[PDB]
Write a protein that binds this ligand. Structure first.
Ligand SMILES: Nc1nc2c(ncn2[C@@H]2O[C@H](COP(=O)(O)OP(=O)(O)O)[C@@H](O)[C@H]2O)c(=O)[nH]1
Ligand SMILES: [N+]
Length: 176
């Protein structure tokens, strides 16, 4: 007893919500996953180099994996895009060196036909760090305001402390 966020959620959806939690390695996805659900994590490997962490919790199905990396594993990623209801993209706000890379990865994801119209929540993570870049600047750097083909939101959070995570999930629940 020391409750996960998916459970605390008020006005939670009615149908099972399929969520994809993506971002670069070290972004804080596993840490975020554990703040969201306490259920046991399943580790699935559809193809070599494609490592998925999957959890079923509180009417939510979450699949988590690191983006970027190898070329030939895109067709395997795409199979999951088709039935995705929400995309949660996680960024390490203190990793300026890889901001350009993660921005490009996000841009490419939003170009995927299979992800058309899927709402996207961007978590500007690790905001507890005194090295974390400002969320308003991250948003401009990701050119989020140019997004016209879907609804989006950027939320400052700390998966470590849990701050801002529920606020982000509240937005997700309003846009399912
Ligand atoms: N200070 C701080 N560290 C975090 C936060 N979220 C994750 N981390 C740390 O970042 C590292 C990578 O996190 P992890 O969840 O395993 O990343 P994943 O590779 O994206 O699954 C670990 O050392 C975490 O403890 C945060 O909000 N604040
Ligand atoms: N801008």
């Amino acid at each position: 007893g020391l409750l996960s966020i998916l459970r605390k959620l008020k006005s939670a959806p009615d149908q099972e919500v399929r969520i994809l939690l993506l971002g670069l390695d070290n972004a804080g996805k596993t840490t975020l996953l554990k703040q969201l659900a306490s259920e046991d994590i399943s580790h699935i490997t559809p193809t070599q180099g494609f490592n998925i962490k999957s959890v079923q919790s509180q009417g939510f199905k979450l699949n988590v994996w690191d983006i970027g990396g190898q070329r030939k594993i895109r067709p395997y990623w795409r199979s999951y895009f088709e039935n995705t209801d929400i995309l949660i993209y996680v960024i390490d706000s203190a990793d300026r060196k890889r901001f350009e890379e993660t921005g490009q990865e996000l841009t490419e994801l939003l170009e995927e036909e299979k992800l058309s119209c899927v709402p996207v929540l961007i978590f500007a993570n690790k905001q507890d760090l005194l090295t974390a870049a400002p969320a308003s600047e991250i948003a401009e750097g990701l050119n989020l305001h140019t997004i016209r083909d879907r609804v989006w939101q950027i939320q400052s959070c700390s998966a470590l402390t849990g701050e801002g995570v529920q606020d982000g999930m509240n937005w997700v629940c309003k846009n399912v």
